[PDB]
């Protein structure tokens, strides 16, 4: 199936509902169901890449597109005071859904260290 | 650019450099928040991700691929976290866009 076998595949195929912010041929942006900030959404590729560590050289433009869409969506959602983008990789990264995605968090002061 | 990261790119002040090519530089953070903590920055002075243009797509993806490759080269095979800070709320410390890569310990949630 298009979108892979994770829960994010079900969202892409619209088998389960999501609060979608943006969609195109390459990616999908939607709100996180467990927000860690007043605004918290994800940007994901429609292509199933399990994690960033296995991305190929030819995935470069796709990954950049995730960041560009993340920035545009943040602007659209009025995060003019700033925001934080996050990618969790693997065990130490805290990854739980193995479909590459970018978090965008805003609407409050983010702290250092980032976890 | 007129930031400390510009000086580092120009080799005017030292940094522990990990990788370089014609369009980016990776180097260890001087104030590390994890056993491994480094930065990947473009040589193009983009002040912050919110001002990146569509034409910068390839370059931004390049930062992430270089980050991935450097993480592997530094032995972060148990995982890591990538971070880009924007503006005041994002805690952006230098107005030259930079990609953080942190690992060598469990990263926690929320990410700040
Ligand atoms: O069905 C969903 N809709 C929206 N967000 C989700 C869903 N399932 C998991 N997530 C989020 O996806 C992230 C997965 O964790 P991560 O792999 O560490 O980024 C968490 O922020 C979850 O709350």
From Swiss-Prot, chain A:
Listed GO CC annotations: cytoplasm; cytoskeleton; cytosol; extracellular exosome; histone deacetylase complex; nucleoplasm; nucleus; plasma membrane
EC number of the protein: 3.9.1.-, 3.4.22.-
Record domain HIT: where: 7-115
UniProt keyword Cell cycle, yes or no: no
Outcome (variant: residue 23 to K): Reduced SUMO-specific isopeptidase activity
Keywords in alphabetical order: Acetylation, Apoptosis, Cytoplasm, Disease variant, Hydrolase, Neuropathy, Nucleotide-binding, Nucleus, Phosphoprotein, Protease, Thiol protease, Transcription, Transcription regulation, Ubl conjugation pathway
Effect noted on mutating residue 86 to D: Loss of dimerization. Strongly reduced adenosine 5'-monophosphoramidase activity. A 110-fold increased affinity for 3-indolepropionic acyl-adenylate and a 100-fold increased affinity for tryptamine adenosine phosphoramidate monoester
Broad class of the protein's primary localization: cytoplasm
Effect of residue 86 to E: Loss of dimerization. Strongly reduced adenosine 5'-monophosphoramidase activity. A 128-fold increased affinity for 3-indolepropionic acyl-adenylate and a 1000-fold increased affinity for tryptamine adenosine phosphoramidate monoester
Protein's UniProt keywords contain Transcription regulation: yes
Effect of mutating residue 86 to M: Loss of SUMO-specific isopeptidase activity
Compartments, as annotated in UniProt: Cytoplasm; Nucleus
Histidine triad motif, short sequence motif: residues: 99-103
Pfam families associated with the record: HIT
Effect noted on mutating residue 26 to P: In NMAN; negligible protein expression due to post-translational degradation; loss of homodimerization; significant decrease in adenosine 5'-monophosphoramidase activity; reduced SUMO-specific isopeptidase activity
Active site: 101 (tele-amp-histidine intermediate)
Impact upon substituting residue 73 to R: In NMAN; negligible protein expression due to post-translational degradation; no effect on homodimerization; no effect on adenosine 5'-monophosphoramidase; no effect on affinity for tryptamine adenosine phosphoramidate; loss of SUMO-specific isopeptidase activity
Gene Ontology molecular function terms on file: adenosine 5'-monophosphoramidase activity; deSUMOylase activity; hydrolase activity; nucleotide binding; protein kinase C binding
InterPro entries linked to this entry: Histidine_triad_CS, Histidine_triad_HIT, HIT-like, HIT-like_sf
Family assignment from sequence similarity: Belongs to the HINT family.
Disease: Neuromyotonia and axonal neuropathy, autosomal recessive: An autosomal recessive neurologic disorder characterized by onset in the first or second decade of a peripheral axonal neuropathy predominantly affecting motor more than sensory nerves. The axonal neuropathy is reminiscent of Charcot-Marie-Tooth disease type 2 and distal hereditary motor neuropathy. Individuals with NMAN also have delayed muscle relaxation and action myotonia associated with neuromyotonic discharges on needle EMG resulting from hyperexcitability of the peripheral nerves.
Protein name in UniProt: Adenosine 5'-monophosphoramidase HINT1
Recorded name of the encoding gene: HINT1
């Amino acid at each position: 199936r298009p979108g892979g076998d994770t829960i994010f595949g079900k969202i892409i195929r619209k088998e389960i509902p999501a609060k979608i912010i943006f969609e195109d041929d390459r990616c999908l942006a939607f709100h996180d169901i467990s927000p860690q900030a007043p605004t918290h959404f994800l940007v994901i590729p429609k292509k199933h890449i399990s994690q960033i560590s296995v991305a190929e050289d030819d995935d470069e433009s796709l990954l950049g597109h995730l960041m560009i869409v993340g920035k545009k969506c943040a602007a659209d959602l009025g995060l003019n005071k700033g925001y934080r983008m996050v990618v969790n990789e693997g065990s130490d990264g805290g990854q739980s859904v193995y479909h590459v995605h970018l978090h965008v968090l805003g609407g409050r002061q983010m702290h250092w260290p980032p976890g």
